[PDB]
Symmetry: D2
Subunit: 251 residues, 4 copies
């Protein structure tokens, strides 16, 4: 029955070709937003767009690299051709190398910062004024539970996700006058294709034990919160961080 007040506008979803991004794109499009699915992986972005269109929705794909500042602008222009851009979801991300801080490779550190932080910033530089010019709207940045707590051996990821909370607060303060809301979502561990394809059973049980609900989350359980926060029903929600974590951070 869930329906989101997101129609009459376009939405960018970065990393939209799989997992959480796919779920976000499907959920927004099923409630009437015209979705621009961007992803580095063209096959995946095209597949999600085909699912949306087959279900009666409106979407277009644009394959490219969010670490190129020009791609952020190309994404905004493409979305505006569908309908006025009023939602952007900065979701693309990478996990990085597993290594303690002292041993973390410099190129992996810089790569994780570049994708998980700087590409969000590049996206927002294109998105903020564009959404303001369309009467306001919402930017949802995909942080993590690791935007507020740590997790050994993934310091670059944790650091970048913490950084996003501040970028979110600042843009919220600066663009409130144009009615551009900016929020961050913090998922716990989610069962996506990487998890069910590569995670060993001992690892899974260990992670499940850290969530009070005793399971990993599902992509659709993140997408619902994103779609809500992107919608007109969330019109007084800005600057804030919203956990969807099964109780992970409550202990």
């Amino acid at each position: 029955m869930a329906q989101y007040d997101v129609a009459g506008r376009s939405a960018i979803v970065t990393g939209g070709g799989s997992g959480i991004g796919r779920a976000i794109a499907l959920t927004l499009a099923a409630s009437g937003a015209a979705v621009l699915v961007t992803d580095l992986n063209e096959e995946n972005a095209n597949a999600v767009v085909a699912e949306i269109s087959a279900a009666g929705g409106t979407a277009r794909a644009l394959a490219g690299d969010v670490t190129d500042p020009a791609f952020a602008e190309a994404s905004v222009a493409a979305a505006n051709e569908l309908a006025p851009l009023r939602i952007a979801v900065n979701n693309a991300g990478i996990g990085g190398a597993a290594a303690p801080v002292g041993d973390y490779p410099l190129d992996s550190w810089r790569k994780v910062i570049e994708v998980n932080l700087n590409a969000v910033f590049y996206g927002m530089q294109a998105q903020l004024d564009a959404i303001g010019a369309n009467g306001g709207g919402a930017i949802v940045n995909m942080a993590s539970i690791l935007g507020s707590v740590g997790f050994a051996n993934y310091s670059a990821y944790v650091t970048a996700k913490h950084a996003l909370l501040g970028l979110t607060q600042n843009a919220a303060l600066e663009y409130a006058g144009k009615n551009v809301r900016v929020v961050a979502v913090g998922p716990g561990f989610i069962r996506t294709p990487l998890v069910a394809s590569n995670m060993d059973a001992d690892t899974l049980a260990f992670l499940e034990g850290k969530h009070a609900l005793g399971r990993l989350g599902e992509p659709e359980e993140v997408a619902s919160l994103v779609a809500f926060l992107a919608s007109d029903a969330a019109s007084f929600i800005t600057g804030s961080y919203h956990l969807v974590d099964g109780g992970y951070t409550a202990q």
Copy 2:
């Protein structure tokens, strides 16, 4: 267009006869939940129930005092007669006397703790097992931005609202195994009947200036978040505190 996945169940809304509670009740009932509106003020609870019924929804009123532990049980029993209780919103609250900590009257301190904290606890003692017995669901506790920051001269209120975050975390951890989610919502300052009836213009401008959006929130902007968190779409959200504050706490 917003619709919440809350049908096929009953919902208790305490303090449901006016303001935020009224909006919560209307929003839940418009998406199909059978709502038990409780309030100390019988006229107000009956009026909201009449609005719900006139709009095609299902509701019943129960007037009484949430500081009586027996009223929490009477509320659960009455809701279960409508449909299985799977949502409870502990929203009733009072502001207390305006006085600094050192001068706060003992009877006003105790009264604010009793209504804003202990009555939530009494409600949860009835609600948690009852919702567990109906296959799980959600309890939404109405904290405030004053559950995480202070506000001079309202220490009893601030203290009680901070307390609710811990009660929420603990019940979330303890009842996750029964799939009873427990969350807290933190509204900024909201334009309800008390605000538009008694607040002077200088006070209003001062409070508006503390929210990045430059206005107070509206009751429906709180109710939407509550209804979302109470719904099946929020199935991985538990233990957490969710601000609807116009940017108040982002600076």
Copy 3:
């Protein structure tokens, strides 16, 4: 070598007859504060005062019950007879019954709220103006890591400790103009006499595993932070919550 800038004044330490309170009292007195040790247990308060005096320090005991608002005033008067009261540490507390929220006995809930929250408030009502009248100073409220996260079956304790963060924020805002700083300390699990006397080995290993340092904290490791925050070196620290938790809340 640690020395705290706390001389030329008196300090109240509630619950000062054992464990963390004892360590706080000893540390403050060793740096020259005149300490009023209060405790419900007269034997214990007298023993700590004797230790202080034997080590060359200045202290007096007052046995009584912090849940009596008059005892807060008697404590302030007794401290002022030693030297001007400029430090108060509200440390007395109880753990409560172990039971989930839904089963928590009403009398145990109310008792934990009364000691761990309301007695802190009663203390502050006496302390705030008195410290202001002596040129300012500091109140240190003893919260816990359970002021910011939960712990199953101890909801009354968690709730009261969360409440203290708000009471601390509010008094800090209200009494900053009189230069009365108010802060909260959040210890992780600490090895006190209750822990080494009654905690089973399996429980201990479980708790140790939740702290990154792999051990419980020691009372002197809490007392040092309290003494620092109570001192003139902490003159710009007010309103804030300071963890001494071995990394417990960083994951």
Copy 4:
């Protein structure tokens, strides 16, 4: 009277030639740590070292650029020649351009991230194992109140300071086994040489009004907390963020 348990070891203080860094260096050296003052400005680093030596302390200067990963290693080697490195304070930082997110120059964004975040990481890569090899110790990262709240037009700074909280949490979790504590300090606005030399009176009054104490902080009020957290008295404090903000974040 304040004395810190920091002798018998060396300490790196980056950005140690002025302001907060100068105060940190002076305070650590006055309690017996052998301090390596690093700064991009050689004149300033030499001046602080001369002050330390004239007061009877032990210090050496090393001028260079913390954004060069090799300088982090040169700093560790130089400190170890004085005494075993067991304290590192990553304090160097820049404010960045004043501009909203959408207009922030790419080169200024990258520069602020490089100094305020990545150079802290480069420092920690040298410091963590070195301190572990000397029996453990402490790294204090200089965040801000802007590690937890925003401030319009300084998004790069806010973002980098938020990032530091996560880097701090992660290193704390990963190096706890070697007894290397890692913490973050969050000063409010502080009256340093930049403030008293360039800040206009209207700006000052505006900032003072945001702190409950009604004034900006002094460098020595930050240095005391840093020195405490760097000391053996802080042996159970790791992973955590400690505000010295005059009440700024308590509202």
